[PDB]
Every structure is written in C-alpha cells, then in structure tokens.
Amino acid sequence: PQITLWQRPFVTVKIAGQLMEALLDTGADDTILEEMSLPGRWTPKVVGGIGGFMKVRQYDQILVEICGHKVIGTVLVGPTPANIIGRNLLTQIGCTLNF
Amino acid sequence: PQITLWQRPFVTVKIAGQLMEALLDTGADDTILEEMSLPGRWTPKVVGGIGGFMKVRQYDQILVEICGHKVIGTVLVGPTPANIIGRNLLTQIGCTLNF
C-alpha cells in the first residue's frame, strides 16, 4: 500500500492473538505497545520522548503481524499514549518514505 | 527521493535563514524545532508525547525549506530532544509511506 499523511497512519496489527491499531512512525527507533499480556521473560528499559522518559518492559523475538505481514522483533510494552510501530519493524515490512 | 528506514530519516531544512536537520516523522501531527529565534508573535501551547508534556511556542505561517523545497505552515518551538517534521508539513512535500 501507498499511504498519504493527511490522517494519522494507523494499521492493524496482531500480536499474541490480540488485535490492535498502531501508528506507523518513522520518528520512532523502537516499537512500543500499550500494556498487554505478552508471555515470558522481559527486560526493564526506559524510553525518552518529547515530554520526558517512560519505563517499559522489553520483549525480544516477538512475532508481529502488521497489516497481515509477519515480522519478528523487539517490542516494548508500557503506559504509552499510542501504540507505535518503529523503524525496527518498519524495515521488515519494506517501508519507505517517498517525497 | 525514496528513503529506507534502516537509519533515522533526517533531512536538511532552512528556516528564517538558519539551517538544521530534522527527522521526517509520520508519528508526529505537528512540527517541533529546538529553541531558535523566530521573529514575531506566538501562542503558548503544550504538546504531549511519550514521557509526558512539553511547553512550546506556536508560530504560524512560517516558511520552511525542507530538502530545498518551500512549504508554509505552523512550527512549534521548544525544548525538544529532536527537531521533528510532522504531518502538517509532510503533506506539503507530497510525502507518502510505501510498504
């Protein structure tokens, strides 16, 4: 798909049997999802945004189905105001900016 | 041009005679630049990101040359960790996501 940017670029994603929408975000290095049950071990991490820092749980080798495409990578889970698909996964769906 | 996302998508921008780099950011509604001297009236505003909220100065009808091409729009100025070109200006340079 080609997507213009007049609206927020949301896509549907499926992770660990659960469905949600997330923003395709070229300004994000990492992928961050709202508090959810992901099974297994994790690592404490903190991410910095525009207003300061946020504590998250880092989960590795997570399967993400993004617009149906299957990719695997690191997902951060915590009290984010928006689910964000960052470049770590965008590269895996062949995402480019064109202008 | 087409830009892949293995690295952060920085572009050179020129605003009020000053040069800087900024992130092309599909996850940003608005454009925010580090503290700089923009002449003229402004409006107090707060933007909410990850980590919380940040106070900014809102400047309207500002000319921005993004990768050499001219657009006009609102720019927020404040203590941002990164200069960010948001969708308000991305739409004006015909920016699309392709995946």
Ligand SMILES: Cc1cccc(C)c1OCC(=O)N[C@@H](Cc1ccccc1)[C@@H](O)C[C@H](Cc1ccccc1)NC(=O)[C@H](C(C)C)N1CCCNC1=O
């Ligand atoms: C930079 C980074 C590094 C590692 C991991 C991650 C997830 C990273 O990205 C986190 C991040 O906040 N990135 C921002 C841009 C970023 C890059 C580098 C440093 C800091 C930040 C931006 O892209 C996404 C973030 C999402 C969002 C948050 C709250 C509400 C709605 C949306 N968007 C916003 O903050 C925008 C701002 C910029 C105009 N925003 C503000 C309110 C209204 N909606 C909205 O669009």
